[PDB]
Short mmCIF file of C-alpha atoms and ligand atoms in Angstrom, two decimals:
data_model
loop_
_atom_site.label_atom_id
_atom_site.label_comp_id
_atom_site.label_asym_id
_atom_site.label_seq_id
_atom_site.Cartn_x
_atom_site.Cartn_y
_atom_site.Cartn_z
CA UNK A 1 51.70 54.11 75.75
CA UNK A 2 50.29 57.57 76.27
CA UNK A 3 47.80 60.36 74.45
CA UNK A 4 49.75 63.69 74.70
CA UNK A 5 46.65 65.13 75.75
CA UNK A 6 45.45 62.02 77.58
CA UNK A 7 47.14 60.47 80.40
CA UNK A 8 49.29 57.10 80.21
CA UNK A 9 47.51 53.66 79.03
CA UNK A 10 48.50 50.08 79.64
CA UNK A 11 47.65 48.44 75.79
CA UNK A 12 47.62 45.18 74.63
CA UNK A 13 49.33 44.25 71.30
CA UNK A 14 46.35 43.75 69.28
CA UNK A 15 44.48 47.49 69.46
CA UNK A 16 46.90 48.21 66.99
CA UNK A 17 45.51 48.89 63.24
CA UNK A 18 47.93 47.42 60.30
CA UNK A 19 46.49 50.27 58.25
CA UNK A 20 48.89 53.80 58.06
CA UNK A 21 48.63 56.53 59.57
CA UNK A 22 46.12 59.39 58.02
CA UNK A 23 46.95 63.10 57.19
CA UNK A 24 44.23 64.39 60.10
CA UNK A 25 45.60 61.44 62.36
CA UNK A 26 49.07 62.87 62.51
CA UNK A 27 48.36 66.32 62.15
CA UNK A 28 45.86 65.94 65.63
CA UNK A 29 48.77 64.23 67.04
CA UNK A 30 50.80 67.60 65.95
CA UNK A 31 48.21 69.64 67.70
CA UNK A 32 48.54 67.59 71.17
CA UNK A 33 51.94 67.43 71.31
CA UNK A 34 51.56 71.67 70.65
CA UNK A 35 48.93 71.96 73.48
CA UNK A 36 51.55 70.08 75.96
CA UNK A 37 54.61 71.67 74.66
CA UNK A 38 56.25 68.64 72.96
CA UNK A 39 58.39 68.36 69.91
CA UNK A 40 58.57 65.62 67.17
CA UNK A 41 61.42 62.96 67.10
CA UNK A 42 64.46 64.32 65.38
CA UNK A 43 65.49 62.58 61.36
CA UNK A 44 68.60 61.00 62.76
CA UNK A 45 65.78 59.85 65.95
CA UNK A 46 64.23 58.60 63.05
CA UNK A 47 67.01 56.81 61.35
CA UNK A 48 68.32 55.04 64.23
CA UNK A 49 65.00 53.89 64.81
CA UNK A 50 64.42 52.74 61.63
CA UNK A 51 68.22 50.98 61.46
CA UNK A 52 67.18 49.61 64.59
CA UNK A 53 63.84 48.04 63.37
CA UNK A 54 66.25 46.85 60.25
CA UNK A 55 68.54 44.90 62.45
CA UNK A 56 65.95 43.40 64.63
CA UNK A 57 63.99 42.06 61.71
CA UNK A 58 67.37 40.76 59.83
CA UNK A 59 69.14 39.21 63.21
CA UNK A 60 69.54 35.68 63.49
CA UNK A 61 68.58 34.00 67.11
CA UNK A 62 70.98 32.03 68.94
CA UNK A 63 70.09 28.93 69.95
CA UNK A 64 69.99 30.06 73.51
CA UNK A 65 67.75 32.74 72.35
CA UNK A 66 65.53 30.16 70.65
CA UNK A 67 65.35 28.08 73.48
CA UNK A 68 64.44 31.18 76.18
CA UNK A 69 61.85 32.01 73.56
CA UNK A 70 60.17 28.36 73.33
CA UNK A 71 60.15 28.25 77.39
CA UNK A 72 58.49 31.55 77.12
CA UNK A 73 55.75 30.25 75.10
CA UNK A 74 55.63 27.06 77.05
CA UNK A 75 55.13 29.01 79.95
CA UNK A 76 52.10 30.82 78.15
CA UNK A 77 50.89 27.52 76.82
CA UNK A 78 47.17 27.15 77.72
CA UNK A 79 46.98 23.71 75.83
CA UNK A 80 48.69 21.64 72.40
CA UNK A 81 48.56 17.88 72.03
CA UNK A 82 51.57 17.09 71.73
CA UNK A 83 53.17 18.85 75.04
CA UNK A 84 50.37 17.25 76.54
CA UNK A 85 51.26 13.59 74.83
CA UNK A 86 54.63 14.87 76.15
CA UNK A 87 53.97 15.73 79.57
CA UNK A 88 51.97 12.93 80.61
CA UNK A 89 54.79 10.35 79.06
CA UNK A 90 56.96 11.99 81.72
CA UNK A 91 54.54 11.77 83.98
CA UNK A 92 54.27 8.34 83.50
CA UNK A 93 58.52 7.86 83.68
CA UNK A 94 58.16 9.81 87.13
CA UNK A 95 55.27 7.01 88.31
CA UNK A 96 57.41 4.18 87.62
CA UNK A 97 60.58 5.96 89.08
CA UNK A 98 58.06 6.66 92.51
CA UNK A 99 57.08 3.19 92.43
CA UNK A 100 60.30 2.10 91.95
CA UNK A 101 61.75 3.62 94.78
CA UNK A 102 58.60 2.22 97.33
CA UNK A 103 57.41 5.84 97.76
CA UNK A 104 53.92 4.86 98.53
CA UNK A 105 53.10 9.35 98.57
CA UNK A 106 54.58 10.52 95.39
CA UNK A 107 52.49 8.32 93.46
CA UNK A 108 49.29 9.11 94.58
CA UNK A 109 49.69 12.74 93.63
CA UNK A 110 51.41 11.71 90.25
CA UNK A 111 48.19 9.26 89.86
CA UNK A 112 45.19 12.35 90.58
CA UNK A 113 47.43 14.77 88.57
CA UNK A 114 47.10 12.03 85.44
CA UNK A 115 43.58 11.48 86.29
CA UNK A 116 43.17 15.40 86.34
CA UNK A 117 45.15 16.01 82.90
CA UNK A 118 43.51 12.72 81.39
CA UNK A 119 40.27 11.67 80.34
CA UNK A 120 40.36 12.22 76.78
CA UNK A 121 37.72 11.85 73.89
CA UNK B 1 46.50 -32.02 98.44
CA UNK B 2 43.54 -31.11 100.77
CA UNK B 3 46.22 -30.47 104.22
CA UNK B 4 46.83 -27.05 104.76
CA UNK B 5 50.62 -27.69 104.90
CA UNK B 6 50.80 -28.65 101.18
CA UNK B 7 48.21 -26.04 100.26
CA UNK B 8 50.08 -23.18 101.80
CA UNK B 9 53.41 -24.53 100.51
CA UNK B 10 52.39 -24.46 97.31
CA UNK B 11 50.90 -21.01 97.61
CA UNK B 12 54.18 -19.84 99.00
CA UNK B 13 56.47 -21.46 96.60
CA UNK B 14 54.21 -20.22 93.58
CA UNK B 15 54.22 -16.93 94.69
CA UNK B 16 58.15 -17.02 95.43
CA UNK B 17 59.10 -16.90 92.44
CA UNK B 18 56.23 -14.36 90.86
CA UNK B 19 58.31 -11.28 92.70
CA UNK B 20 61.26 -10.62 90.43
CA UNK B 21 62.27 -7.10 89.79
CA UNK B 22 66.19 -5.67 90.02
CA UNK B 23 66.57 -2.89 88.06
CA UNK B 24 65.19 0.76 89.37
CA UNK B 25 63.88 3.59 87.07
CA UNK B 26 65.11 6.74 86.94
CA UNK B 27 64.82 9.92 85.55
CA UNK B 28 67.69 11.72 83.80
CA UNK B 29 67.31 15.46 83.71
CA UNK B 30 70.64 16.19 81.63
CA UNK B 31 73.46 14.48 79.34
CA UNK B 32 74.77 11.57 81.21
CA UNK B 33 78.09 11.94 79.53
CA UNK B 34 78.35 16.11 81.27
CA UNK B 35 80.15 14.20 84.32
CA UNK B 36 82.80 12.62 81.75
CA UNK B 37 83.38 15.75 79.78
CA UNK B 38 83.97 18.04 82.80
CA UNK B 39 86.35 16.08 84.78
CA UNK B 40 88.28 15.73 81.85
CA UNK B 41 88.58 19.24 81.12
CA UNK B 42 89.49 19.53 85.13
CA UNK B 43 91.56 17.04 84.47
CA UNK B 44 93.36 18.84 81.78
CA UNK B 45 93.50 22.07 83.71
CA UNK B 46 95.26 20.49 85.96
CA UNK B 47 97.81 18.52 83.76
CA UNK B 48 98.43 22.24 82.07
CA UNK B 49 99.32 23.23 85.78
CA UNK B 50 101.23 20.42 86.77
CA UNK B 51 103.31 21.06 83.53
CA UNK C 1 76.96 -9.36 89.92
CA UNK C 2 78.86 -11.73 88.33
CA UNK C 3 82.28 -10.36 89.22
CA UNK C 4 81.27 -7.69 91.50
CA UNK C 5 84.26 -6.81 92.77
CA UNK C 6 87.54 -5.52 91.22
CA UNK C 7 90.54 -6.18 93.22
CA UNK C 8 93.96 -4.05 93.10
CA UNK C 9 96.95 -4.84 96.03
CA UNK C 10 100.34 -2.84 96.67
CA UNK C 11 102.09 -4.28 99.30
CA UNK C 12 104.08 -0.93 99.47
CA UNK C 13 107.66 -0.93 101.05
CA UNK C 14 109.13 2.99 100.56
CA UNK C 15 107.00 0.03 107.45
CA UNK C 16 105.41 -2.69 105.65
CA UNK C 17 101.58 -1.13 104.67
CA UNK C 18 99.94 -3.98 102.89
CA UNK C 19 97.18 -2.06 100.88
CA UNK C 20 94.08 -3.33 98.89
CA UNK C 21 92.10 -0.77 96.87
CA UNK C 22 88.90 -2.48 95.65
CA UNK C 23 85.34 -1.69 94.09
CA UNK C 24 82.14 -3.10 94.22
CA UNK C 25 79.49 -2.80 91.54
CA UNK C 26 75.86 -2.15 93.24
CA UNK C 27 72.03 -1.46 91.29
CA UNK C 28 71.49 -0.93 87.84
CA UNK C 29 69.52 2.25 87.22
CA UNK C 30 67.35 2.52 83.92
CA UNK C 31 65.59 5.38 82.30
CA UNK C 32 63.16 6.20 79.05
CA UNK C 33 65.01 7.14 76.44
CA UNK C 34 66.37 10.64 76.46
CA UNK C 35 67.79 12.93 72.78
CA UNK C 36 70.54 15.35 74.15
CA UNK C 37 71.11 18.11 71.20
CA UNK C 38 73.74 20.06 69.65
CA UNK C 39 72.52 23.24 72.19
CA UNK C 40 73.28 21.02 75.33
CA UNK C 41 69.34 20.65 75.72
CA UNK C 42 67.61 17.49 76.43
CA UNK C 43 64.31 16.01 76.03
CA UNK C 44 62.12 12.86 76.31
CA UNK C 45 62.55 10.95 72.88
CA UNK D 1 67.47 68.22 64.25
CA UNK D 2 65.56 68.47 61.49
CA UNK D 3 61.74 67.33 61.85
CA UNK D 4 60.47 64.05 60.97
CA UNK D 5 58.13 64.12 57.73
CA UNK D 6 55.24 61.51 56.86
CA UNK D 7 57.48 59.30 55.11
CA UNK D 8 60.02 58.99 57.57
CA UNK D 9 56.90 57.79 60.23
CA UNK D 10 56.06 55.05 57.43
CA UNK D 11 59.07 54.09 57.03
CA UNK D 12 59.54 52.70 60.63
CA UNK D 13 55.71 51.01 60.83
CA UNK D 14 55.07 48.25 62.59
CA UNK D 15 52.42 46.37 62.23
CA UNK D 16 50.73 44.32 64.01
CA UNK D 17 51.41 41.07 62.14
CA UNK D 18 55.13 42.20 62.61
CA UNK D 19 54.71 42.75 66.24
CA UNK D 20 53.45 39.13 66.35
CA UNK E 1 40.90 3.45 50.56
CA UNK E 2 37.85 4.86 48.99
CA UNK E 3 34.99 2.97 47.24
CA UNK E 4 35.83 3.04 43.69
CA UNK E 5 33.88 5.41 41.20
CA UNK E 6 33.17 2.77 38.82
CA UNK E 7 33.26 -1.25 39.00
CA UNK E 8 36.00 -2.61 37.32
CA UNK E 9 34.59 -5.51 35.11
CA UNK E 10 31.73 -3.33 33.46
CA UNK E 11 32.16 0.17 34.55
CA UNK E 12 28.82 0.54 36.48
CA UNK E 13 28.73 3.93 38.93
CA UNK E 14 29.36 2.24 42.15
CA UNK E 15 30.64 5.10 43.86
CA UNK E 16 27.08 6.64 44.80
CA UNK E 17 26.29 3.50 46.88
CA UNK E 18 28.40 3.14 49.93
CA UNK E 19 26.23 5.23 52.14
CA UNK E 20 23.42 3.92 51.43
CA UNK E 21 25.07 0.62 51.51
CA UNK E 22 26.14 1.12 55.30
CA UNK E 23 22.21 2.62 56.34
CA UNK E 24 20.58 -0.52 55.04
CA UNK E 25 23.11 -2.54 57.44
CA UNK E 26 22.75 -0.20 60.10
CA UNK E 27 18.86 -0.96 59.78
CA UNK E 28 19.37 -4.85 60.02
CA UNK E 29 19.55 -5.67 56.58
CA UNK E 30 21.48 -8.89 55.16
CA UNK E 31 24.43 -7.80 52.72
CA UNK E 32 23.02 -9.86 49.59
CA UNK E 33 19.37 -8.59 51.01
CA UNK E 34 21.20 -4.30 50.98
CA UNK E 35 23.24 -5.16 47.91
CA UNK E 36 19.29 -6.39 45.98
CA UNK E 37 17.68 -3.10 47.30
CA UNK E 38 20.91 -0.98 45.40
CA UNK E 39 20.11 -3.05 42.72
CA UNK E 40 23.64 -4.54 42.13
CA UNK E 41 22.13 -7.82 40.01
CA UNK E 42 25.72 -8.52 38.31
CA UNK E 43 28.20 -10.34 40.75
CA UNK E 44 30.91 -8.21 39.67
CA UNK E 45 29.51 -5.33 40.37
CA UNK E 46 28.58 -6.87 44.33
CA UNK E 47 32.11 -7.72 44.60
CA UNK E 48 32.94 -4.14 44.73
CA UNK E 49 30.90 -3.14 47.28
CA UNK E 50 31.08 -6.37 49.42
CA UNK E 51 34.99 -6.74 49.70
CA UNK E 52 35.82 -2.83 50.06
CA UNK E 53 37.69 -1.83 52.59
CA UNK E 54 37.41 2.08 53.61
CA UNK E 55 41.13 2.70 54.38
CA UNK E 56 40.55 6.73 54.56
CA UNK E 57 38.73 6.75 57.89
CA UNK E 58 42.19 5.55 59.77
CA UNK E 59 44.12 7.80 57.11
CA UNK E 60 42.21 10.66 58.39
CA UNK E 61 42.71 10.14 62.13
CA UNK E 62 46.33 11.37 61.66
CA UNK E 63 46.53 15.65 62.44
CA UNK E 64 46.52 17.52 59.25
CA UNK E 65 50.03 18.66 58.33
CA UNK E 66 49.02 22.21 57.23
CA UNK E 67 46.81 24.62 58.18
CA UNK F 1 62.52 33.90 51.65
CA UNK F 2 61.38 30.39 51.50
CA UNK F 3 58.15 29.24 53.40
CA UNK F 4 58.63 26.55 55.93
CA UNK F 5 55.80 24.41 58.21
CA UNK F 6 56.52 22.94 61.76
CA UNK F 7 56.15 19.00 61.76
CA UNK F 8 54.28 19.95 65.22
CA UNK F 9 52.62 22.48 65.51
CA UNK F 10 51.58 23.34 61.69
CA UNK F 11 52.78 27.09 62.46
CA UNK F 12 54.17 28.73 58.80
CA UNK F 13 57.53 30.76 59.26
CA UNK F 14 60.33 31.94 56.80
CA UNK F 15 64.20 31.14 57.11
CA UNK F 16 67.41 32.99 55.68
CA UNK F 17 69.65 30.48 55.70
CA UNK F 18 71.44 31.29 59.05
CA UNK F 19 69.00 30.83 61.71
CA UNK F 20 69.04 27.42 63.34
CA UNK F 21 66.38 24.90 61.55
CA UNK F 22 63.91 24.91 64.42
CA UNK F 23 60.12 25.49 64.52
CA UNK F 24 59.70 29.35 66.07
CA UNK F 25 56.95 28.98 68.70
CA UNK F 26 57.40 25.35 69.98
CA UNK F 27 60.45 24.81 69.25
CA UNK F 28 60.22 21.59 67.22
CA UNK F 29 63.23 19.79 65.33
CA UNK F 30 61.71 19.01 62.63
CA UNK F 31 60.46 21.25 59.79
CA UNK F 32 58.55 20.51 56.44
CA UNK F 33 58.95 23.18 52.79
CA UNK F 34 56.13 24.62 51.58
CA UNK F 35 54.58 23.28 47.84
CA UNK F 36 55.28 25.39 45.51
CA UNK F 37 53.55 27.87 43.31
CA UNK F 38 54.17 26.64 39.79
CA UNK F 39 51.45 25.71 38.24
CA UNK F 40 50.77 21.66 38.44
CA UNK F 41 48.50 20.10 36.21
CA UNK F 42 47.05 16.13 36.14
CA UNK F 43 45.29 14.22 33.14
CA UNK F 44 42.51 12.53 34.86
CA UNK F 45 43.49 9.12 33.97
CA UNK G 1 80.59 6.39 95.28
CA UNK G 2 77.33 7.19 93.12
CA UNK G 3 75.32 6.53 89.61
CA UNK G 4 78.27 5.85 87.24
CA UNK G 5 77.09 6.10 83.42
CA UNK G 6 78.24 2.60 81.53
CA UNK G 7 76.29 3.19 78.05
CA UNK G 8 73.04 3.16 76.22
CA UNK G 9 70.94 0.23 75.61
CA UNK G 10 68.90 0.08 72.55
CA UNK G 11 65.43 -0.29 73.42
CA UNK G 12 62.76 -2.66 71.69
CA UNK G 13 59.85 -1.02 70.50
CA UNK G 14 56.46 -1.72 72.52
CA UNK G 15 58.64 -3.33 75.06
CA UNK G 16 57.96 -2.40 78.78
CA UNK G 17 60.55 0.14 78.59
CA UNK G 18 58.76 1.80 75.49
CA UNK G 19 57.24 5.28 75.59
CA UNK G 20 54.66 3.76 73.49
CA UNK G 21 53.70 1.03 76.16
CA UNK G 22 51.43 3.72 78.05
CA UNK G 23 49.84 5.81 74.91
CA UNK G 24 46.84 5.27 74.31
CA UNK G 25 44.75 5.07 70.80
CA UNK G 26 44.36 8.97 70.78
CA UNK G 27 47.93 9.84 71.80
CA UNK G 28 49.43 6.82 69.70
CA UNK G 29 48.14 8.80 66.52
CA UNK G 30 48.87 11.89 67.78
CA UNK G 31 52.45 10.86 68.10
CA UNK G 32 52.05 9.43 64.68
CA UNK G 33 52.67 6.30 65.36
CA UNK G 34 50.42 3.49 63.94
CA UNK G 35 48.45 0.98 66.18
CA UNK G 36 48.36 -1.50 63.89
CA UNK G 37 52.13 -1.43 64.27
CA UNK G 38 53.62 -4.40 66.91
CA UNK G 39 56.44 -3.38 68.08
CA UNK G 40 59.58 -6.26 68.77
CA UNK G 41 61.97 -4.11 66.90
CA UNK G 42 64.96 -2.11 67.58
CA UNK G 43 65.87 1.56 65.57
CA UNK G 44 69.32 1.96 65.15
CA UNK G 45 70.44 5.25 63.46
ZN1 ZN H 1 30.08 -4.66 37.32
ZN1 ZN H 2 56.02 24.12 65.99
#
């Protein structure tokens, strides 16, 4: 995002106040984008934005969509019990199919990554 | 019982028959039945084409 | 490995060319079991 | 053309439980 | 599941007795010796605290459903 | 319109009848419905 | 000539082909799954 009379910031999601915008709020806003030389968003700006918003809230996801959105998460997944139940059962089907297969190096690495992950209270 | 032959026949034939393992794990990433489907649509194509 | 191997002949005449087309069956592979979905996804069950 | 009111800004807020 | 409230013969309040029921045996008491010093004289009213089972403390090793 | 609960996670969500019945965040099968808000009432005996 | 799929095998609960042969106490419950529970049973549909 960007102050008009300020320079361009980098925000997280959660700076962001639920509450609406004031009278002074938006009329200091007016003033800044004055100072620069700006203009407001046009009413049919404003419409397609707001049909936009509409749509987005009202679509349904594919499953594809659903799916990219879960991996997505995964990926940002610190920790949950159950992916971690999960990912230590396949752990454990990759350890037998290593041991299986007489590859005496696999294992050891699948063994100190379950040691690592394990140890639960 | 005490001669070593006996002793280490015994060990050998116990321990024979303690190793017994056939089947290999493995680890299926996707549907086993993708192969089937595929070549049979291939399979059609190719029937359509021959047609 | 009881019947391991499937046997088909064609002593084909159309230079006589005896052929034998046969298969043998080799390991068993197992897994754990696996839920494939709707989607096409799969997943330890 | 025309330019945007008060009402048509709260119309199109988003908050933060909606970003979410 | 959970130590009844009352005993079911007579109806005594036996339902403000099961933790101090399970100090006394954690300081070496007998049972009939913890079950005196509650002062459970009646039989029936020792059979309720003697035979209980507390079936909540594996019920509540399951994750909560809501939150 | 209708509250749901993810047999997973525990994560509350809302459904319109055409999205696919999955939990939102990770992506669970299996989903729960909400108690209602009608007003329930026991007799203590 | 490579892995040819014949079928699924039903697999016996607690068996060494079980998921639930490695889980522990912790990760038995929190796959809700009861350890009280034996195993030496099959689920079919
Ligand atoms: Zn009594
Ligand atoms: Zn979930």
């Amino acid at each position: 995002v960007a102050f008009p009379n300020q320079k361009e910031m980098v925000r997280p999601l959660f700076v962001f106040s639920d509450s609406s915008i004031t009278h002074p709020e938006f009329d200091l806003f007016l003033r800044e984008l004055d100072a620069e030389g700006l203009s407001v968003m046009d009413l049919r700006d404003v419409d397609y934005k707001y049909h936009q918003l509409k749509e987005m809230s009202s679509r349904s996801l594919s499953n594809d969509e659903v799916n990219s959105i879960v991996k997505m998460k995964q990926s940002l997944s610190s920790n949950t019990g159950f992916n971690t139940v999960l990912k230590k059962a396949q752990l454990q089907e990759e350890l037998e199919e290593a041991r299986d297969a007489h590859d005496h190096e696999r294992v050891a690495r699948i063994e100190a990554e379950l040691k690592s992950i394990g140890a639960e209270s | 019982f005490q001669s070593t032959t006996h002793q280490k026949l015994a060990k050998a034939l116990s321990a024979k028959q303690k190793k017994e393992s056939y089947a290999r794990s493995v680890v299926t990433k996707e549907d086993p039945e993708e192969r089937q489907r595929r070549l049979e649509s291939q399979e059609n194509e190719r029937y359509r084409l021959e047609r | 490995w009881e019947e391991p191997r499937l046997i088909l002949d064609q002593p084909a005449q159309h230079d006589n060319i005896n052929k034998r087309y046969e298969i043998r069956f080799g390991k068993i592979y197992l897994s754990r079991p696996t839920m494939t979905e709707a989607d096409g996804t799969t997943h330890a069950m | 053309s025309k330019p945007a009111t008060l009402s048509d800004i709260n119309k199109i807020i988003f908050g933060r439980t909606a970003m979410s | 599941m959970i130590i009844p409230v009352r005993c079911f013969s007579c109806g005594k309040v036996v339902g403000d007795k099961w933790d101090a029921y399970l100090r006394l045996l954690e300081e070496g008491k007998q049972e009939g010796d913890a079950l005196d010093e509650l002062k459970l004289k009646r039989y029936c009213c020792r059979r309720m605290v003697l035979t209980h089972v507390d079936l909540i403390e594996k019920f509540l090793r399951y994750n909560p459903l809501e939150k | 319109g209708v509250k749901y609960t993810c047999g997973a996670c525990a994560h509350n969500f809302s459904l319109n009848k055409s999205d696919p019945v999955r939990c939102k965040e990770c992506g669970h099968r299996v989903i729960y419905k909400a108690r209602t808000k009608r007003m329930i009432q026991f007799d203590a005996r | 000539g490579n892995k040819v799929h014949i079928g699924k095998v039903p697999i016996m609960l607690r068996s060494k082909f079980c998921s639930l042969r490695t889980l522990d106490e912790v990760d038995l419950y929190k796959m809700k799954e009861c350890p009280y529970d034996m195993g030496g049973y099959f689920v079919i549909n």
